Amino acid sequence: MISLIAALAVDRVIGMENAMPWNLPADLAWFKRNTLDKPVIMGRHTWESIGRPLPGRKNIILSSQPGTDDRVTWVKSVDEAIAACGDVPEIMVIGGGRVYEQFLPKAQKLYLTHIDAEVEGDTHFPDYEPDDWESVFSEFHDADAQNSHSYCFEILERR
Amino acid sequence: MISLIAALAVDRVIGMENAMPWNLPADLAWFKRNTLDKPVIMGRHTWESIGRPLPGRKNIILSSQPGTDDRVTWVKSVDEAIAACGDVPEIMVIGGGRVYEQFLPKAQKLYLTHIDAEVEGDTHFPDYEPDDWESVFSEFHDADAQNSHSYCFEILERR
Ligand SMILES: Nc1nc(=O)c2nc(CNc3ccc(C(=O)N[C@@H](CCC(=O)O)C(=O)O)cc3)cnc2[nH]1
Ligand SMILES: Nc1nc(=O)c2nc(CNc3ccc(C(=O)N[C@@H](CCC(=O)O)C(=O)O)cc3)cnc2[nH]1
């Protein structure tokens, strides 16, 4: 099963030119815990930004480009992407945008981080129809000494 | 010779209850670079924000309470602290708020990082009579893929 995971700001903003202005270790931590030991699919840019494969996980890159790093697996198609995940219980899509778009329709579960932040982004998580999904988990947290903003943990299952 | 280093948001904001909303890897670099191979004087909470002893530097913590970590050197005054530095060309003072207050008077130089952001502050960089200093270096930068905000670095010497 495919699952998407993402951090979202107000308006479903997920990306921009510049570095996101916020400090969410707790989020990083959530992400971690939810991806660890699972295959992860991501696009080129994401891969770039990250700059090293994520330890503990089968890193799969979705590009058209040929890719240098042999530490990961590159693929050119959604089908391939999936193919490369083998026999697993959950496949985790980590974006970006188009990636999310592509996988959304195959996606059965979503892990979303809702951040109380307002920014001018260039990228947005694809709109999804609420009526189609069920919140089976949600967990609010205020900003604290380590998290610059308040944010909330949500997991939706496809209805 | 004494110097102070700090990064100030608008209005001398240097701290908040919660996490600063910005991510400035470049300022840290600047910080590292200007503090390396010199004694760094800090106050207890910074030290606790830092969590470990800064490599390449000699860590002096000014406080009322008694040590907790054999690694660094604890002092109770500004004279001791200054003492603990020994004969060295420049002593770097690093915060927080109180500390900087107590050293401001003896400083001959300021290493400032003016951050482009409005935040409701809890601590502030000591006020300093701009007439009393000469800017001797300044360097602007724009926010980018790695730094959420724009900032300018500056060095001021006591006139
Ligand atoms: N919820 C969510 N939060 C995110 O930050 C996020 N980021 C991406 C893509 N960007 C990144 C960037 C960095 C790392 C990363 O460094 N991950 C480390 C966490 C390291 C830590 O705890 O410092 C990992 O080992 O998973 C992952 C994804 C995708 N989905 C997200 N989804
Ligand atoms: N310009 C400036 N920026 C700061 O962030 C700052 N911080 C303090 C006290 N706060 C801190 C907290 C953590 C680290 C720290 O990890 N420093 C590393 C750099 C690490 C890196 O390159 O990630 C060091 O080794 O110097 C430093 C200062 C004092 N003056 C400052 N001054």
Swiss-Prot record, chains A, B:
The keyword Ribonucleoprotein does not apply. It comes from the Bacteria. This is Dihydrofolate reductase. GO terms for biological process: 10-formyltetrahydrofolate biosynthetic process; dihydrofolate metabolic process; folic acid biosynthetic process; folic acid metabolic process; one-carbon metabolic process; response to antibiotic; response to methotrexate; response to xenobiotic stimulus. GO terms for cellular component: cytosol. Substrate binds at I5, D27, R52, R57, T113. Pathway: Cofactor biosynthesis; tetrahydrofolate biosynthesis; 5,6,7,8-tetrahydrofolate from 7,8-dihydrofolate: step 1/1. Residues 1-158 form the DHFR domain. It catalyses: (6S)-5,6,7,8-tetrahydrofolate + NADP(+) = 7,8-dihydrofolate + NADPH + H(+). Its EC number is 1.5.1.3. Gene3D superfamilies: Dihydrofolate Reductase, subunit A. InterPro entries: DHFR (IPR012259), DHFR-like_dom_sf (IPR024072), DHFR_CS (IPR017925), DHFR_dom (IPR001796). The keyword Signal does not apply. Key enzyme in folate metabolism. Catalyzes an essential reaction for de novo glycine and purine synthesis, and for DNA precursor synthesis. GO terms for molecular function: dihydrofolate reductase activity; dihydrofolic acid binding; folic acid binding; methotrexate binding; NADP binding; NADP+ binding; NADPH binding. Keywords: Antibiotic resistance, Methotrexate resistance, NADP, One-carbon metabolism, Oxidoreductase, Trimethoprim resistance. NCBIfam families: PRK10769.1. Changing M16N: Increases catalytic rate about 2-fold. Increases catalytic rate about 7-fold. The gene is folA. Belongs to the dihydrofolate reductase family. It is an enzyme of class 1 (oxidoreductase). NADP(+) binds at residues 7, 13-19, 45-46, 63-64, 76, 95-102. The strain K12 sequence is shown. Changing M42Y: Increases catalytic rate almost 2-fold. Increases catalytic rate about 7-fold.
